[PDB]
Amino acid sequence: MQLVLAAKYIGAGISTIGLLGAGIGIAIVFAALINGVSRNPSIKDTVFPMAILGFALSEATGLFCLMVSFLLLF
Amino acid sequence: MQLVLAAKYIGAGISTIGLLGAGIGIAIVFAALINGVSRNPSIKDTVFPMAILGFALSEATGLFCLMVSFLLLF
Amino acid sequence: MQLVLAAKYIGAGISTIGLLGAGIGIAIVFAALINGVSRNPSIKDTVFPMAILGFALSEATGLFCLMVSFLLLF
Amino acid sequence: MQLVLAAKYIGAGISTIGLLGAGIGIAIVFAALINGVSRNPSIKDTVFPMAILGFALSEATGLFCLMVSFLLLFG
Amino acid sequence: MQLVLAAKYIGAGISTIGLLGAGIGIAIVFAALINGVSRNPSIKDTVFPMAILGFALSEATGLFCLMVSFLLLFG
Amino acid sequence: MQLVLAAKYIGAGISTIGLLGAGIGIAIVFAALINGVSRNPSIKDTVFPMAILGFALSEATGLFCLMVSFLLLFG
Amino acid sequence: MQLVLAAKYIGAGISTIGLLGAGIGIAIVFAALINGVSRNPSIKDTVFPMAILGFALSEATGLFCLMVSFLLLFG
Amino acid sequence: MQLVLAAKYIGAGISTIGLLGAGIGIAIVFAALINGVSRNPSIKDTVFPMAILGFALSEATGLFCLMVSFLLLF
Amino acid sequence: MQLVLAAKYIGAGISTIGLLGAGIGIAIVFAALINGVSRNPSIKDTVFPMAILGFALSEATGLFCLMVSFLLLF
Amino acid sequence: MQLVLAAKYIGAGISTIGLLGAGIGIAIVFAALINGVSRNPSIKDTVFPMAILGFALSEATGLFCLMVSFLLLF
Numbered sequence: 001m002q003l004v005l006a007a008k009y010i011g012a013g014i015s016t017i018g019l020l021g022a023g024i025g026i027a028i029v030f031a032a033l034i035n036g037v038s039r040n041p042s043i044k045d046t047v048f049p050m051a052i053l054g055f056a057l058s059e060a061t062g063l064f065c066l067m068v069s070f071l072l073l074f
Numbered sequence: 075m076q077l078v079l080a081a082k083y084i085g086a087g088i089s090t091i092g093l094l095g096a097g098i099g100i101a102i103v104f105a106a107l108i109n110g111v112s113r114n115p116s117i118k119d120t121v122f123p124m125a126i127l128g129f130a131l132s133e134a135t136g137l138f139c140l141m142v143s144f145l146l147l148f
Numbered sequence: 149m150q151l152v153l154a155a156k157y158i159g160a161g162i163s164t165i166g167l168l169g170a171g172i173g174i175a176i177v178f179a180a181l182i183n184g185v186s187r188n189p190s191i192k193d194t195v196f197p198m199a200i201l202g203f204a205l206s207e208a209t210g211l212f213c214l215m216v217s218f219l220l221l222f
Numbered sequence: 223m224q225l226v227l228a229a230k231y232i233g234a235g236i237s238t239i240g241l242l243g244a245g246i247g248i249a250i251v252f253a254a255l256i257n258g259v260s261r262n263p264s265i266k267d268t269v270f271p272m273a274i275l276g277f278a279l280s281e282a283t284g285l286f287c288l289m290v291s292f293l294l295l296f297g
Numbered sequence: 298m299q300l301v302l303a304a305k306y307i308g309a310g311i312s313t314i315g316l317l318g319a320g321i322g323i324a325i326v327f328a329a330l331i332n333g334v335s336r337n338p339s340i341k342d343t344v345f346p347m348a349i350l351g352f353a354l355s356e357a358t359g360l361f362c363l364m365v366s367f368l369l370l371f372g
Numbered sequence: 373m374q375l376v377l378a379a380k381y382i383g384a385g386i387s388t389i390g391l392l393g394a395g396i397g398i399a400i401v402f403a404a405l406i407n408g409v410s411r412n413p414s415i416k417d418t419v420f421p422m423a424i425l426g427f428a429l430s431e432a433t434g435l436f437c438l439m440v441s442f443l444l445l446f447g
Numbered sequence: 448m449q450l451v452l453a454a455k456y457i458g459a460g461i462s463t464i465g466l467l468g469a470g471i472g473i474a475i476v477f478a479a480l481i482n483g484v485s486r487n488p489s490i491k492d493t494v495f496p497m498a499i500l501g502f503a504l505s506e507a508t509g510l511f512c513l514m515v516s517f518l519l520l521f522g
Numbered sequence: 523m524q525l526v527l528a529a530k531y532i533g534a535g536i537s538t539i540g541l542l543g544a545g546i547g548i549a550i551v552f553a554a555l556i557n558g559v560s561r562n563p564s565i566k567d568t569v570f571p572m573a574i575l576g577f578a579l580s581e582a583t584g585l586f587c588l589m590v591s592f593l594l595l596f
Numbered sequence: 597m598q599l600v601l602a603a604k605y606i607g608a609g610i611s612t613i614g615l616l617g618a619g620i621g622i623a624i625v626f627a628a629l630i631n632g633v634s635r636n637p638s639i640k641d642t643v644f645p646m647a648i649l650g651f652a653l654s655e656a657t658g659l660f661c662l663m664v665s666f667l668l669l670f
Numbered sequence: 671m672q673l674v675l676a677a678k679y680i681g682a683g684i685s686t687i688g689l690l691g692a693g694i695g696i697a698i699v700f701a702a703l704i705n706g707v708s709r710n711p712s713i714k715d716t717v718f719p720m721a722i723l724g725f726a727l728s729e730a731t732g733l734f735c736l737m738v739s740f741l742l743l744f
């Protein structure tokens with residue numbers, strides 16, 4: 001079981017790499033929001049919900065990386 | 075059999091890396107949506123279905139990374 | 149036998165990494181579509197088929213990563 | 223146990239790689255804040271809180287990487 | 298024999314990583330096509346063959362990643 | 373003992389990879405600062421403290437990559 | 448020799464990763480060509496040869512990766 | 523002893539990877555400097571010190587990668 | 597000598613990764629040239645030598661990756 | 671001793687990866703130079719020394735990756 005356990009811990013570490021995708025993706029969404037609102041303040045109420053949807057969909061990819069990570073750890 | 079199970083676990087972890095691609099890609103689509111609607115609010119109903127299509131096609135790449143992951147885990 | 153099986157499962161995981169390219173590339177195409185349409189709405193019927201060709205060619209790289217992956221798993 | 227311990231410490235080092243995403247993401251949010259304010263100073267009080275929220279959400283992806291890292295080091 | 302076969306299969310998987318360059322590069326070319334046509338519709342017949350040349354050349358890099366992959370898988 | 377020490381040193385080297393995020397992110401913040409001040413010099417006193425906040429937060433991600441590195445090296 | 452052969456084939460797969468640079472680089476040159484021509488059509492005969500030279504030089508970095516790959520596979 | 527020495531030399535090589543961040547980041551700062559000065563030459567004396575602070579902070583990440591590297595080699 | 601030779605071949609493969617830097621960097625220089633000339637054709641004779649210098653300095657990094665590669669192979 | 675030499679060779683290869691950072695960074699500086707001079711030709715004598723400084727500082731990161739490489743090789 002030593003080899004299998006060792007692999008579980010290597011695997012769990014590898015599985016967090018994909019979180020960099022959500023880290024960057026979430027930022028890209030919020031950057032667009034800020035820039036869109038700065039150029040056209042009246043559009044705020046329209047684009048804010050688009051940013052939330054964007055965030056959630058990008059975040060979901062990171063969430064699944066973590067799930068695989070924790071399946072391997074536990 | 076210990077060596078094969080080890081491989082399945084390390085493999086599962088490696089297969090989540092590609093999810094960074096959906097994480098970022100989905101955000102890129104939403105950033106475009108926000109910036110297009112801020113510059114031209116009247117175009118919202120035209121470009122929103124394009125953003126949904128674009129999201130879904132980028133997300134499918136992540137979905138299949140995750141299929142490979144789950145196939146290795148289980 | 150056991151070592152070869154181990155290699156195929158690691159190989160399968162690695163072969164999905166390339167899917168990040170399609171995930172990002174499909175997004176870049178759709179981002180251009182949305183931005184082009186927002187700036188010039190009358191061009192929609194011209195650039196939409198271009199985005200579809202773009203998506204298809206970028207997707208092909210992803211498909212062939214996944215092909216190698218399934219040849220390794222099975 | 224020599225192999226399991228070895229894996230815990232390799233795994234912990236690997237689990238920090240994900241932090242590059244928050245280091246880059248946080249910067250992207252702050253760049254946008256700066257560029258938006260320079261172009262439209264009167265929007266500062268509106269966008270500053272959006273930038274704090276964006277930072278917070280981007281940061282959380284980094285925090286989870288480090289949690290996994292700490293679990294492998296100390297658990 | 299067992300170790301060589303193992304390495305061929307690891308090698309083949311690694312050789313697909315390079316395909317991400319074609320996946321992204323083809324997109325970049327098509328993004329420029331779409332943006333240039335949107336800004337100047339009258340130029341489309343001129344830039345369309347440039348986009349086909351660009352896609353083809355970027356794709357060729359991915360084609361050779363694949364050739365190495367198949368040589369390791371089927372050689 | 374030998375294998376665990378080996379892994380601590382490999383782990384410590386891997387844990388520095390994440391620092392590239394801070395290296396790039398800090399730059400992105402300063403690039404926005406410079407570009408926003410060039411386009412609107414009157415805003416500089418407003419955006420300068422935003423740039424310091426942004427740099428600090430991006431840097432914190434790299435600081436924790438380093439902490440893991442030092443924990444493996446000196447723990 | 449089982450170990451040496453294994454290494455030749457792993458090495459060959461790794462040596463294709465560099466090809467992503469040419470796949471992306473070639474695209475970047477062609478994107479610029481397209482965008483420059485769309486913005487200034489009369490410049491086409493001037494920039495088209497610059498784009499061919501840029502592609503050629505970018506491609507050469509890909510060609511050398513594949514050479515190393517072929518040496519490890521066939522030499 | 524031999525395995526530990528082997529690890530320190532692999533570890534040393536890996537620890538330089540992070541230097542790509544400074545290599546790119548220092549460049550991004552200088553690119554902004556050159557672009558800002560070209561667009562507004564009268565701002566040079568204001569933004570030059572900002573670029574130097576920028577360079578220094580980005581360089582610090584690189585320096586500490588190299589510190590880990592030299593601690594491993596020696 | 598089997599282990600050392602195996603390492604020479606792994607090492608030589610790893611050493612080509614850095615070539616992606618020159619592949620992309622050279623392109624970035626030529627993209628700027630093309631865009632600069634398109635915006636201001638009269639500047640061609642001025643910026644062409646800057647592009648050549650840029651190319652050569654970016655290429656030098658790729659050249660050294662290859663040197664290390666061939667030292668290891670031979 | 672075979673294991674240590676193996677490590678030196680693999681390590682040497684790994685240490686050239688960071689050179690991609692100079693490859694790209696140097697190009698980014700030169701791209702800015704070209705684009706700044708195209709937009710404002712009169713600024714050439716001001717920004718050219720900034721591009722040289724920027725090149726040299728980005729290149730130094732690559733230079734030290736290469737020092738680590740050569741130290742491992744020899």
Ligand SMILES: *N(C(=O)NC1CCCCC1)C1CCCCC1
Pocket residue numbers: 019022059060062063066282283286
């Ligand atoms: N994404 C995530 O689930 N974020 C939450 C945070 C609060 C608001 C709702 C979404 C991250 C995925 C990786 C782990 C940390 C959270």
Ligand SMILES: *N(C(=O)NC1CCCCC1)C1CCCCC1
Pocket residue numbers: 060061064093096133134136137140
């Ligand atoms: N993409 C995905 O399937 N997203 C869903 C979100 C809800 C609406 C339908 C599409 C991701 C693939 C990787 C794991 C997380 C989901």
Ligand SMILES: *N(C(=O)NC1CCCCC1)C1CCCCC1
Pocket residue numbers: 134135138167170207208210211214
């Ligand atoms: N791209 C892809 O191949 N899409 C096809 C699917 C079949 C019908 C036409 C479009 C993606 C590659 C990765 C997996 C998901 C599909």
Ligand SMILES: *N(C(=O)NC1CCCCC1)C1CCCCC1
Pocket residue numbers: 241244281282284285288432433436
């Ligand atoms: N981000 C982070 O989680 N910041 C939090 C810390 C607790 C108080 C609120 C902000 C970074 C994640 C990586 C480590 C450094 C902090």
Ligand SMILES: *N(C(=O)NC1CCCCC1)C1CCCCC1
Pocket residue numbers: 208209212316319356357359360363
């Ligand atoms: N590009 C590619 O090589 N396309 C060719 C295929 C043969 C017929 C002409 C076009 C892609 C490279 C990655 C895999 C899919 C093809």
Ligand SMILES: *N(C(=O)NC1CCCCC1)C1CCCCC1
Pocket residue numbers: 391394431432434435438582583586
């Ligand atoms: N950023 C960082 O953590 N800076 C701190 C150091 C302590 C005193 C306040 C600023 C860098 C992270 C990578 C290594 C160099 C420091």
Ligand SMILES: *N(C(=O)NC1CCCCC1)C1CCCCC1
Pocket residue numbers: 357358361466469506507509510513
């Ligand atoms: N680039 C390349 O070397 N193209 C050459 C081929 C010979 C004739 C002149 C152009 C690519 C490098 C990776 C493999 C595909 C070609």
Ligand SMILES: *N(C(=O)NC1CCCCC1)C1CCCCC1
Pocket residue numbers: 541544581582584585588730731734
């Ligand atoms: N950055 C760096 O630390 N520069 C210092 C060098 C000493 C004098 C002040 C500037 C680089 C980090 C990687 C190695 C080269 C220097």
Ligand SMILES: *N(C(=O)NC1CCCCC1)C1CCCCC1
Pocket residue numbers: 507508511615618655656658659662
């Ligand atoms: N860079 C390189 O040396 N290019 C030459 C090509 C002819 C004109 C002078 C410069 C590349 C480095 C990696 C191997 C291929 C060449």
Ligand SMILES: *N(C(=O)NC1CCCCC1)C1CCCCC1
Pocket residue numbers: 656657660689692729730732733736
């Ligand atoms: N940078 C470098 O030292 N460039 C020289 C080029 C001539 C003028 C002085 C600086 C590179 C570092 C990695 C290897 C190639 C050189």
